[PDB]
Amino acid sequence: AYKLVCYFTNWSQDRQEPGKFTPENIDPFLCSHLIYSFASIENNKVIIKDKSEVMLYQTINSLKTKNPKLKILLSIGGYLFGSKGFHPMVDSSTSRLEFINSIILFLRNHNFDGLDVSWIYPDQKENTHFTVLIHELAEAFQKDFTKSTKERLLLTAGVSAGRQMIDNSYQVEKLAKDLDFINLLSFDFHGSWEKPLITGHNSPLSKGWQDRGPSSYYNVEYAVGYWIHKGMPSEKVVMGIPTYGHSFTLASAETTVGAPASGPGAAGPITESSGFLAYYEICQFLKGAKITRLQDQQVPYAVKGNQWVGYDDVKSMETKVQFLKNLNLGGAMIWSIDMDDFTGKSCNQGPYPLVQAVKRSLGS
C-alpha cells in the first residue's frame, strides 16, 4: 500500500492564524506516517527543544490511540542544523554509541516508531560520517528488535534531489540496505539562491522543453530516476511534494520561466520569510494574479505586479501522484502539512486541501 509521509514542524506553533499550528491540528487518519521536525543533540544525546514538548507527547499518544496503525517518527537535521549540528556527536565510536543508545530509549519512552535523519547535507566532506552513522543506527535498531517484543524502530532519511549533491553525499546501494525508505526532498529545485538570478519552479515534475544538459536534472522525474538508477529500489523512494512555493521579485517586464529577478519575492504576512510562501498565503496571492500552467513541467506559476511565484496546487499534485504510482514508488511525502491550509480558513477548499487531494489520489 502507498505511504503518505507527512512532516510537521516545531516552529509553526509561533505563527498567527491561519498559520498557527500545534500537534492537535493533526488529523490522525490523514497520513500513514507523521514526522516531527526537528529534534536536536546535546551532550551526544537526542533532545527536543520545544516549550510545547509535553503537548507533543500527549498528542502522539492520543493520535496513536485513535489510529492504532499510525506511525510517528522523530526527525533530526534540516537545513539550519546543517552538518555542524551532528558534531561532535559523529566523530567517534563512543560518542555515536551514546547518541544511538539515547535514541532508542527516547523513541521507546515517548512512543515514536522510528528516526528520520535528514542531514542537509553530508556532501563530500561528511559522506563517510553520514554513511557510518546510518549503518550503526540500522544495526542497533535491528539488535534492539531481536531483544524486544515491540516492532523494529524504523530508520529513514530525507535526502537531496540534486544530482551533484547525491553523487557527493551518499553511498546509495548501502543506504538501500540500511534504510526503511528515503524521504526524497524533491523540491527547492529553483529559488532565489541561484546565480544568475532568474525565475524557476520550486518543484517541476519534468524538465522544460528547452532544458538540455545539466539544466535537465532539476526536476522530480529526473531525481527519482537517478536515485533508482544509483541503486535505491523504487518502493523505498517516498517522493517529496511541497505545500509551499518559491517567490521572486521580477527585474523587468518579462514574466516567463527564466525571466530576470532582482531578488526573492516579498515575505508573506504569516511565514514572514522573503523567498517562500505557504499554500494558505499562496491562495490569497492568487486573487488578482495571472496563473500559467507549464505543459512541459506540469506545474503552475502565477504573476501579480512584480511578484512571480512557482507553486503546487491540487491539479499538479494529482499529476505527481499519477507519476509516483506509475513508477511504483513507496508513496508520497509532504513538506510540510502545517503549510497546507490545515484549518481550511484561507483557501475556501476545506481543511488540508493539498494533502487530502494527495491522499484521495493515492487511494483511488
Ligand X SMILES: CC(=O)N[C@@H]1[C@@H](O)[C@H](O[C@@H]2O[C@H](CO)[C@@H](O[C@@H]3O[C@H](CO)[C@@H](O[C@@H]4O[C@H](CO)[C@@H](O)[C@H](O)[C@H]4NC(C)=O)[C@H](O)[C@H]3NC(C)=O)[C@H](O)[C@H]2NC(C)=O)[C@@H](CO)O[C@H]1O
**Residues of the shown chain interacting with ligand X in the complex, contacts defined by CB under 6 A:** 7, 77-80, 118, 120, 158, 160, 162, 165, 185, 188-189, 191, 193, 218, 244, 273, 276, 335-336
What minimum distance in Å lies between the beta carbon of 268 and ligand X? 11
244 is in an annotated binding site: no
Q: Which is nearer to ligand X, 191 or 300 (CB)?
A: 191
Task: Report the interhelical angle of 314-326 vs 220-229 (nearest 10°).
Answer: 20
What minimum distance in Å lies between the beta carbon of 93 and ligand X? 26
Residue 331 grid coordinates:
508513496
Task: Report the interhelical angle of 123-146 vs 93-109 (nearest 10°).
Answer: 50
Q: Which ranges of 39-109 does DSSP label H, i.e. alpha helix? A: 53-66, 93-109
Q: Which is nearer to ligand X, 144 or 257 (CB)?
A: 257
27 is in an annotated binding site: no
What is the number of other CB atoms lying within 10 angstroms of the CB of residue 151?
Answer: 10
Q: Which is nearer to ligand X, 141 or 276 (CB)?
A: 276
335 is in an annotated binding site: yes
What minimum distance in Å lies between the beta carbon of 318 and ligand X? 22
Q: Which is nearer to ligand X, 144 or 268 (CB)?
A: 268
325 is in an annotated binding site: no
80 is in an annotated binding site: yes
What minimum distance in Å lies between the beta carbon of 272 and ligand X? 10
Residues 219, 206: contact at Cβ < 8 Å?
Answer: yes
Q: Which is nearer to ligand X, 102 or 118 (CB)?
A: 118
Question: Using the 8-state DSSP alphabet, how is residue 260 labeled?
Answer: B
Q: Which ranges of 147-254 does DSSP label H, i.e. alpha helix? A: 163-169, 172-178, 220-229
What minimum distance in Å lies between the beta carbon of 194 and ligand X? 8
Q: What is the full DSSP assignment across 294-348?
A: -TTT--EEEEETTEEEE---HHHHHHHHHHHHHTT-SEEEEE-GGGS-SSSTTTS
- Candidates 267, 351, 340; CA nearest to 309 is 267
50 is in an annotated binding site: yes
Residue with the closest Cβ to ligand X?
Answer: 162
Q: Which is nearer to ligand X, 144 or 184 (CB)?
A: 184
What minimum distance in Å lies between the beta carbon of 216 and ligand X? 12
Q: What whole-number distance in Å separates Cα of residue 22 and Cα of residue 26?
A: 8
56 is in an annotated binding site: no
Q: What whole-number distance in Å separates Cα of residue 128 and Cα of residue 172?
A: 12
Specify binding-site residues: 50-51, 77-80, 121, 185-188, 335
Specify binding-site residues for chitin: 50-51, 77-80, 121, 185-188, 335
